[PDB]
């Protein structure tokens, strides 16, 4: 077996106007020290980690406004109070004004320390999509 | 020491997403050889000559067929809407999953008619035991 | 633990009119042999690597034919193009200039040799976006 800290949390299809992460679901886990505290993954030990996250946005008809969709994975060091962007993307789904779909996939390898908190956050949770399993997730893998 | 797999799409097998190896590849699916944590990853590239009048949806999904629960369950999935000039749309999936010995894994798309076999190093699917 | 070569370099927000990669920054790294020489990642050993890169373009409106390119190339010790994308953000010209956003992600698995130099390059660095960290990056992961 592997003693490697790993985590794969999935979005709750019933957290009104927010992106709430869960481990107590099928095909989602927290293992070898990784904790999910206040919607954030707590790094159990210093090392290199693969951080990833995907969100799927969907909008029934192109809204009557230019819409900005952001997805950001942040790092809050043990002492820090707020985010420090690790990976971030911003997409404009609506050029003009049929349902649109926009997935955002962030991933990279980062050096993390003992007790750092990682958060995957979006600006528009009103456009999230949970109509199918495995479309919205956040995870980490120690190398 | 640790089971690994990296299969690529067959360019010469047009109209379907068929995987080719260099873990077993049985009936277009990766068979997990032992219980453990695995990194599952995949990428597909779509391409189309302009936009048709009938709306289009492009999906890519990695599924699991558990040794107790014989039904396909979604592990990772994404959906993109690409719509007289051509377009290109990649979809990439990856995550860490606890798998059991004998689990079948299948990366699948809905529209193989829009696949881009032209990009070799871009249509792939693999697993890495941690 | 992991002896596998990994790299995650980020664009310098200060560097005007160019896409300059940095490792000497917080939440950016070079590990297990990967070097950053003359804006290029030097592959330390033969093997299969995941090559990933993201750039974010932003422009204040659509004036009267923009082409935005992003390309990853390998220079052997034999110059080759690995991944490339070209986007036209203004597929309609604003006749109130609303800002457009165009992210380009390139990624693939490639067999590389020891001493290969990898470069992630764009044609229009005047449209780059440095409003927040984590938006522009280039990295490799040995498999
Ligand atoms: O603990 C250990 N030890 C062994 C294993 C190695 N290792 C590892 N291997 C392969 C890959 C990879 C290979 C091919 C992909 N194709 C995509 N991915 C792959 N990961 C995703 C998802 N997507 C984009 C992307 C971008 C950046 C990072 C990820 C990814 C497509 C990522 N990590 C680091 C962790 N490990």
From Swiss-Prot, chain B:
Changing residue 66 to V: Biologically inactive. Residues 1-130 are extracellular. Disulfide bonds join 51-83. It comes from the Eukaryota. Residues 3-130 form the THD domain. It is found in: Secreted. This is Tumor necrosis factor, soluble form. It comes from Homo sapiens (Human). The chain holds residues 86 to 233 of 233 of the full protein.
UniProtKB/Swiss-Prot annotation, chain C:
Changing residue 132 to K: Biologically inactive. Disulfide bonds join 62-90. It comes from the Eukaryota. Residues 1-143 are extracellular. Residues 5-143 form the THD domain. It is found in: Secreted. This is Tumor necrosis factor, soluble form. It comes from Homo sapiens (Human). The lineage of its organism: Eukaryota, Metazoa, Chordata, Craniata, Vertebrata. The gene is TNF. The chain holds residues 84 to 233 of 233 of the full protein.
